[PDB]
Amino acid sequence: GRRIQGQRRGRGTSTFRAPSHRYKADLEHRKVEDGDVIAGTVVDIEHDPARSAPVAAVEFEDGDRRLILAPEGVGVGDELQVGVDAEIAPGNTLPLAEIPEGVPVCNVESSPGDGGKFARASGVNAQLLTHDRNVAVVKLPSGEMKRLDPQCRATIGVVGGGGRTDKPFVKAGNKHHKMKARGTKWPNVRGVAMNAVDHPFGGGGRQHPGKPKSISRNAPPGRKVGDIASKRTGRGG
Amino acid sequence: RTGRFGPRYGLKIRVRVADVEIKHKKKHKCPVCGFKKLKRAGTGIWMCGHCGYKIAGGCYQPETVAGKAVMKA
Amino acid sequence: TGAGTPSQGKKNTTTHTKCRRCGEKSYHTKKKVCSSCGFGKSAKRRDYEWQSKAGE
RNA sequence: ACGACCGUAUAGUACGAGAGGAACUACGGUUGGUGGCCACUGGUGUACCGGUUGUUCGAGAGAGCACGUGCCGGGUAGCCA
RNA sequence: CGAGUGGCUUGCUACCUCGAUGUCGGUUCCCUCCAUCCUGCCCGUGCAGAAGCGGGCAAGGGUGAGGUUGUUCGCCUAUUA
RNA sequence: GUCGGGUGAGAACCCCGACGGCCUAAUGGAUAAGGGUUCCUCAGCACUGCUGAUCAGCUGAGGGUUAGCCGGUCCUAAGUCAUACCGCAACUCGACUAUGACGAAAUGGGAAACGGGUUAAUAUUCCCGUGCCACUAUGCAGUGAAAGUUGACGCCCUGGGGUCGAUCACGCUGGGCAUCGCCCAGUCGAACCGUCCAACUCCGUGGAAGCCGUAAUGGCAGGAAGCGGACGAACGGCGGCAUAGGGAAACGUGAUUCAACCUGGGGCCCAUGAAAAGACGAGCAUAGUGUCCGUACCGAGAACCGACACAGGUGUCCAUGGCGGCGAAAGCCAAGGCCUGUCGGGAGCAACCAACGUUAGGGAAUUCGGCAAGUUAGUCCCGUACCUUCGGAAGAAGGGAUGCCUGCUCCGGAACGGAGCAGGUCGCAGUGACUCGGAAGCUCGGACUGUCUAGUAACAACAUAGGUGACCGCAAAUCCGCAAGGACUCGUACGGUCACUGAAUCCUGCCCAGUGCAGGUAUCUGAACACCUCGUACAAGAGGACGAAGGACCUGUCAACGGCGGGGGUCUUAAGGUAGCGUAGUACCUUGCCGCAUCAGUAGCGGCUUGCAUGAAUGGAUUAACCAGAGCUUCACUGUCCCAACGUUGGGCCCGGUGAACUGUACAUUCCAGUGCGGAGUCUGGAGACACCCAGGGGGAAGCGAAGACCCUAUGGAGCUUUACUGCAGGCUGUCGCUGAGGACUCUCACUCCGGGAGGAGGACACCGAUAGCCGGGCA
RNA sequence: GUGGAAGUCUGUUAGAGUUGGUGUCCUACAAUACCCUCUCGUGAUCUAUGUGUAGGGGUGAAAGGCCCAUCGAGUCCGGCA
């Protein structure tokens, strides 16, 4: 047959890429020599075309002007601080160690200095649970308990824009516009709607998959579609 | 509200659009001053026409159930 | 729309042009490569053994 | 190039207990087919005459265009049913 | 039970056409056959009459209009000699 | 087109005049691409031109395109290339990272030009006049000078400022008409320099506790109105330019509505609407410099693409010319263009055909079907059912009005804007043409707008929001690459990948036996290396011990593939069809039975229903709205029909000119029969038959067109599928190399990742190379 | 009353599309055209120019559609007599 669509993606052609040139900034925590002295002021709140969530423009003391993954509750005028000795208020960033357990955090680093990887989507947040000299235990939005170097920096508070998922798109038109700002081919044709040649589920005089949908982890690309290595399916039990 | 949808989309779709947007368009009491002059500027962006304070809030509400939990903790 | 006659009408784009190197009208001005001599792609001239019978 | 039917007289008669109910013949009409014709009825009739909308020729008068008549009303000859 | 005729159905055969003989139904227009539905002339009757039933000669003419169905067929309606 | 006339050897179609017409977002005007000399002039007609030609986009020869201020050039966009680096056997190959360059002529950004005149042909390029910009030099001023502003920005609604245009009033100039007194054209004048400033923002004053203000939102003791002031707009006003220019002349003044242009206010996003050069910031005089490329013409029913002077296709600007009217609509008419959608002459002009008008009485009887045609129609008033997701249904349905003339009223500042009144009055008809819905009901399907088979399918198919399941914590899941590397990703679970289902509403039962996926696993099975035994002076080779993934085995899982029967009052193989729906777009029997409806209904709808062989996200039921989707019924309508007729235009027929193709073994005036490989103009027997020609409608030449798509055959092909055969990627796993120190463990030094670095995490694993076992239609 | 929302309605505004006529054409005007009819027409809209993706690969709101009149694997030349 022909390559299925998931293989077409990999090639990174125009149709599958993200309109990067239209994106604003790569939100990442600032680098600080040390001391923590670094502080700055919230000059403005903008829309991030890459995350459909708000982002804050900040002016740091040393002249640096950079956009920042904005947590809920940050307004124009506010002063944020980044450093080991940063105060403990929403919007400020400091290593998990300096953060008091029981506090909601976002934009957490996977390894100290990477600039933040975890909990950055609309209204999400991690939960710093346990401290230690060696391990900082954090509960990521998926609910997983993640062990992190207490040196990984993070932002206090929950990411702004919460509740976006609450309201239905209502019409194709609205999905359309959202999709056009992402690295995604849309709309989606159902495999079972295609021809044998185009997809393992295609073909037949009626529409149904040929074999069972749960595919083995070991399946090669081109065949790995449907329910990937499903541990179970359906709702019963 | 949802009336701009005519007899399209169904009950739940547009009942949730009116609900979200009715709360969405409500007078909101600003964080800086105490005045109820906060309006949505866009997705998750709120401002007060009174002092002009521009804030980061929920997508359709200035405060989210999670944003409040932060104040405490 | 017919892919035939009616689709011939939009053909007012210039592509292959007089090549600076070989003098043939095969310089694709959009690609900046000659389809005849390879100018723009290869310093060596384009040539292939299949341009003639195998034993000639 | 004529085919067939109905009706009237025959006759409420022949026949028949009755109920019911013929014919030969002579008539009138219908239907289908055929050939022809237009006094009559009807159709057409962008011959013709009138009414009238829009616009242009300044108004008037008189006209053009609106698909091969703008539309509406009437309609001779002829051709037709 | 026995002897046949026809070549409309169906089956059988594989002779003819695979460098193609355009399908079913319908329509329109033309000719024909008789194993005769009506009409003409007749015979028998379990033929009183009237209405029938059966049979003989006979192909001149006629054999129409509709409801369902693509239907042929057929089913159904009202007319009809 | 027609009548005259001009030129010419020759004139229907070359030219002049008149008369008659065509084009109105184009048949006008300016252009992009593309063409490439097609442009102008002279001379021609062998070629080309659907006829002719004195004409020409043809033939020949000459001529023609002038720029500091229009484009290019310059900037940067999606993105592209070059060099370096690395990969590759290798390259003219390849991803990343650097650097450099390229990348916009209508239509991104952008220093600067206007008016008039002139040529056969150029023109913001030449000439005349006037103005402007940049750079450099000289001189005076200036020490400021880089912060900032600008360049520079989405969609919807809307106020104000305002020119052109159009119109109105009145005056002037010229023209037309000639029963009035009307009708038409004109009444001009730039860039630029100077000046004026609404809106927004802000300052002072003031001091509102209810006022201020808008079309609307709105504003305020955190200081409203009012008053005074700072900043501050037009391609606008005003003055100059200008006893410039232009006009035969007059060479106007006011107004209304106001494209351009300027300047504000509001609303929307699960969508956030370029960048860079450059400019400003940052004065003035004088002088010098401003090179290089484009410039003709067409821009289309003859200059472009489509073999053609092709009825096709092809971007931008002129969207403000008049009447009309809601209108960038119709219809009619200007300006401008055209009679070149380029062959003509003749017949009352027959048959037949294409487009079309009208048809009495009937009114769907026509037909698969109302296909085609027709009906209805604009605007206002009244009035409007079932159903419904409360939006809708709805313009439901149905009823009435509608012109002109006279004099008025109301809204508004007013309109050459709108709404109404009274009276008079004509026609068969007042949305008088044009423009311009037929309506109602039942059922099926898909919820909706949207998508599709360029070229026989527009649908019920796809998509969609919505529902649902699966994978993954980012050194991820998924995917591309041989590699170097890469998409997703300027992304981080409210994410994005992989699938199913397909809005709302009510719901979504039972089954894990098979298959799939996933987890576990005492024991069993399970390869190679290393190890042990036998063998060989070694080696082949035989055997043993250990045992990974995987399998056996056990479990979980159906919104995972799928299943939901026979028999009796359990058996196959796990369960044994629940809610619903049902003769279904699923029902073989079948035109099922009953009913509705019709004269008559294999149709349609409702009820029943043992369902050949319905049924729950292989989603079930149901459902308002929507629909060039499928079936049916009613009113209305009508040449669909009974049953045809007449007419209109273009052909057809005759004449001049031009001038193909299909097709052709031969012979051929055939008809009825027969015969023949069973479907004969040609054989046989008869019959008929004087030759030629015109027109017709197509019976025959198993007519012409296409080496039959159907079918079969070929040890033919291809696309597709799988538990067909054999292999291949890829994934998982063991082992060896990289690889180091002290059946479980620590460390650090290779190696990997994070960090700008210091250093941090990880660590002999991982990655890579080799090999072995399993899976392996993803691929061959 | 104001406001002026909408994958909202009417609409040959421009533009886009292509339902029926199974009309005209079918050695065409045309190797997909002509006419009437019909659908969309503020949006998942239409469109110019520039630009990216390449052949067992693209692209595909999925029809095996499309990739220069070429598609169940383009075209050119070669293998090839």
Ligand SMILES: [Cl-]
């Ligand atoms: Cl999404």
Ligand SMILES: [Cl-]
């Ligand atoms: Cl130019």
Ligand SMILES: [Cl-]
């Ligand atoms: Cl305003």
Ligand SMILES: [Mg+2]
């Ligand atoms: Mg980033």
Ligand SMILES: [Mg+2]
């Ligand atoms: Mg969702």
Ligand SMILES: [Mg+2]
């Ligand atoms: Mg919406």
Ligand SMILES: [Mg+2]
């Ligand atoms: Mg995209």
Ligand SMILES: [Mg+2]
């Ligand atoms: Mg889909």
Ligand SMILES: [Mg+2]
């Ligand atoms: Mg399909």
Ligand SMILES: [Mg+2]
């Ligand atoms: Mg497959």
Ligand SMILES: [Mg+2]
């Ligand atoms: Mg399905």
Ligand SMILES: [Mg+2]
């Ligand atoms: Mg093609």
Ligand SMILES: [Mg+2]
């Ligand atoms: Mg006329």
Ligand SMILES: [Mg+2]
């Ligand atoms: Mg034949």
Ligand SMILES: [Mg+2]
């Ligand atoms: Mg007989």
Ligand SMILES: [Mg+2]
């Ligand atoms: Mg006879």
